[model samples]
Target chain A: MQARKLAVDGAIEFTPRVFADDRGLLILPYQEEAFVEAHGGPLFRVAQTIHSMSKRGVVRGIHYTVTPPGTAKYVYCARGKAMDIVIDIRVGSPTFGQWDSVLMDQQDPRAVYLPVGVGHAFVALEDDTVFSYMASRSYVTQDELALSALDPALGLPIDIGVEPIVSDRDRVAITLAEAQRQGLLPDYTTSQEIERRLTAVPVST
Target chain B: MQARKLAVDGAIEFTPRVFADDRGLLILPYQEEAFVEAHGGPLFRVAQTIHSMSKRGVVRGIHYTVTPPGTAKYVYCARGKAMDIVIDIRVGSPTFGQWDSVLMDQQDPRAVYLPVGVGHAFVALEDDTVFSYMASRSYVTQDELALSALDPALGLPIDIGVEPIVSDRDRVAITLAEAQRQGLLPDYTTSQEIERRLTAVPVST
Candidate 1:
């Protein structure tokens, strides 16, 4: 697998040399060496592996897992196609407020790695597009937060050629600035604080 | 919503009354009062909300979030239909190795509650079946584990009336006996230990 950087400081993309045959294509969705090589640290581990299936025109997220127990994601499209987006919401980060997108499809082994405090959203380009994710931390709803996908300030390029459908929650999610004003956006200092904890925390034997 | 206890000790089923008319339908997938009253506890707050889409005959998991930091789950079908199963895999538990299931469909607001250390698996009965999950703990891969859905001794009734399609990883997953021999199954004691941590933890203001 080859790793590439997206616009944001902690965001990355991965594409693998897929082999095609009658049985279907074969690919290694994750390569630890390339991940650690790209991440420069080994805080990247899959504490949770999740899979979601969406219909075309469906938009879910701009979602972020809370820091302190923040999460990093390695996501890929398994069945169909989608445009996955990542936004920097960690204040003080070099690319704060910036965003990037990855086009994921069945034919190619394309995936995205969004770091702690980065926001993620995607639009299903085809019906039954299966999105799989590997995350670094466990989920806690109180510890998870989201920004409006339609927020004007952090405009994410998620047009699905039709009016994208979204959950009522995402539809009314607070904008980044609004969240920040309410002291909700993860600060770079706090983001940094969470990032370091991802290091191997040895479990008591 | 009415909650029903399945054959499995740690698993519960929820069936919300669906209201429909000319415009659309209304179903409360998770009503806190019903959930708390049925479980004899407060509404279990969601740490992470998960959604998955699967094609007909697709089998995703007999997956478990590693206990110690074990996770609890509340799952439902948002669309189409599925047969969801739960198995008690915790060692030293009274009901260890017993299994039960729920039939989830969109028209009927059906869901399942699975406790930590239990094994979970499901089969999508139709194209574009959607399974949604609300979990107790965040994900941690090392803390996550799996058992074969095809494990003979712990036979999970996952027949979708068709050949099942599964990932290579799940296909070759270790059986319950093998997992126990390797000391991979969560102990009943530790399972209890992690269950208590789901209580709200106050964060500094």
Candidate 2:
């Protein structure tokens, strides 16, 4: 496996070597050594793992965690196709407001890593698309905050020739500009510090 | 999530609550609390995680790990349907030679826990079935061992109407009886002690 840096600072993409045989194939989406080499630190101790399924044209996120307990994520498209988007939402960051995307499917299986305080969103291009991810922090209702995926300023690639099926919460979510003006965006320096502390304590396997 | 014991001693099943809305659903196959409550211990620290994709009629395993560094597994069916089987290949176990299976699919997302030394096999009933699992130990080619799933003495459920697609290695694998006679089978008591030690130190996240 190898890691490639993304447009968003600290966010990366990992592509594993898929081992194939007559009956089936195997892929290791997360490898400790590969991640540590790329990130200059070990992967965070995962507190939560999530598997979410979605249908075609469904758009989820532009979602992020509020800083004090910021979250970092390693995500993979398990079953179907999706366009995974990562946004540098942390304020005062070199790449603030910059975003990158990865196209994931069975043929070219790939995974993405989002540093603490970065934003994540995905648009399912096929039905029964399952997105699996490991997070550094557990989900806390108050800590989870979302910006509109349809926010004109951000202009995420959510359009897929059909009405984007978005959650009511996401549809009504505030824009990134609104969030920044309201002092809701996480601090880039603080996020980096929290992320450093997370990787400092590695989980002994 | 909740757990139910299986016929094979020390092997268990877990079913998680599926949270659904109009867009899609979410399922957590493995949970710390549910597992600890049922097993009276934390889950084995995961050293390797595998994602395998198979076609219809593919029968993989009747596989086990060599003891001293035995492996424990927590398995989930991520995509299609499969009959995940657990066989008590641990020598001197009360349930030695006994076997049980769990039908896994999307409707009722479930996971299975296989203790060290037990055998694991799964038959894919549909095309593109995905089996995902976490293991207590990493793979060592020489430490990995297999038994024939087609062995008449064990009578595993490998027949699924269509011709069973088995790997050449599995097809030529020895039977459980042969393995036992050759002293290749793991000791039940040893397996228990290894499992206990695995979950003794929980991974701090």
Candidate 3:
């Protein structure tokens, strides 16, 4: 396995071995060693593992957690193909508005790591596209915040030839600029501190 | 979340909340609390996370790890649907030869926990059925062993109306009786001991 840094600061992509034989295929989506090597810390103790299934042209995110108690993710496509997008939405950071994308499919063992305060989204290339993630924090309604994937300034890719079917909430979501102006975006220094503390404290099962 | 014991001893089923919205549904496949309550220990320290995608009628297992360093599994369906089966294959066990099944789908948050020595198999009920699992041990080719999913004696349910498309290795695999006769089956006591050590020891990343 090997690690590659994406455009977003602290964000990384890992390529694990995709083992295939007569019986379908086996993929180790979350390889811990490469994650530790890339992040200089153990992957955020997975508080929850999430899986979502989408059809073609369904754009699901561009969402991030409200920091303070931030969330980090290690995500991969389990079934079909997807174009995973990671955006740096942290305020006052060097690579603040930068973004990166990774092509996720059943045949590849590529997975992306989204550091705290960044935005995550994916465009399903085929039906029954399963996006799975290991999250550092549990789901909290108040902690979750969404940024528009269709925002012109960020220009995140959600185009997959078909019309994108997005949620009503996401369709009406504000842009990164608006969130920043309203002081809703996470502070760069605070998010970094949170990530450090998360790594230092071992998760108690 | 709640835990229910299966017919197979030490085998359990858990139902986590499936949160759904306009976007897509989110499922926490392996809920640690339910697992801890059912097994009296944290879920086996996940060394590897595996995902396999299959089409209708694909029968994938009745597979178990060769038990000196046995593998325990926490499995769920991430997309589509499957009939997840767990069979008591450990010799000398009270539930030996007995088996249980769980209906897994994208809409349901149901998952199964297979103890150290049981056999696991799943029948894909629809196209693009993604079976995701958190395995206690890293995959070792020599350590993996499979039993016949189509064995008449076991009468395991691999039926989904469509003709079962099984792997060559699984299609010609030995039966429980044959494995027991060949002294290749795991001992119930040894398996229990292995499970205890696994729970007692902390996994180092």
After the best TM-score superposition of candidate 1, give how far the Cα of residue A99 lies from its true spot, in angstroms.
0.5
Q: Which candidate leads the pack in lDDT?
A: 2
Per-residue lDDT of candidate 1, residues A72-137 (tens digit) = 776777667888888888988899888898989966758787777888998888886767665666
Best candidate (score: TM-score): 2
Predicted candidate 2 versus true structure: per-residue lDDT over B77-183, tens digit per residue = 99889999999999999999999999999789889989989999989998888988777776787999999998898888778998889988888999999999999
Q: Each model's C-alpha lDDT?
A: 0.72, 0.87, 0.82
- Candidate 3 lDDT over residue span B1-205, tens digit each: 7788998999989887877665556677765556667888776555677878787889988899998789988887776798899989899899988999999886665888889998998898887677888777878879899999989887877886767888888888998899999998888999999988766634478
TM-score per model over all chains: 0.53, 0.91, 0.83
Order the candidates by DockQ, highest first: 2, 3, 1
- Tens digit of per-residue lDDT, candidate 2, span A1-205: 8789998999999997889988888988877677778888876655556889999999999899999789998888888899999999999999999999999897888989899999999899999899987777767778999999988888888889999999988999999999999999999999999999877734477
TM-score of chain A of 2: 0.96
Predicted structure with the largest DockQ when compared to the true one = 2
Quote model 3's iRMS: 2.6
Who is ahead in DockQ, 1 or 2? Answer: 2
Candidate DockQ values, in order, are: 0.06, 0.53, 0.43
* Residue A149, candidate 3: C-alpha displacement in angstroms: 3.1
Task: Order the candidates by TM-score, highest first.
Answer: 2, 3, 1
Show where candidate 3 strays beyond 4 Å.
A16-23, A106-109, A125-127, A159-164, A181-183, A193-205, B16-24, B106-109, B125-127, B159-164, B181-183, B193-205
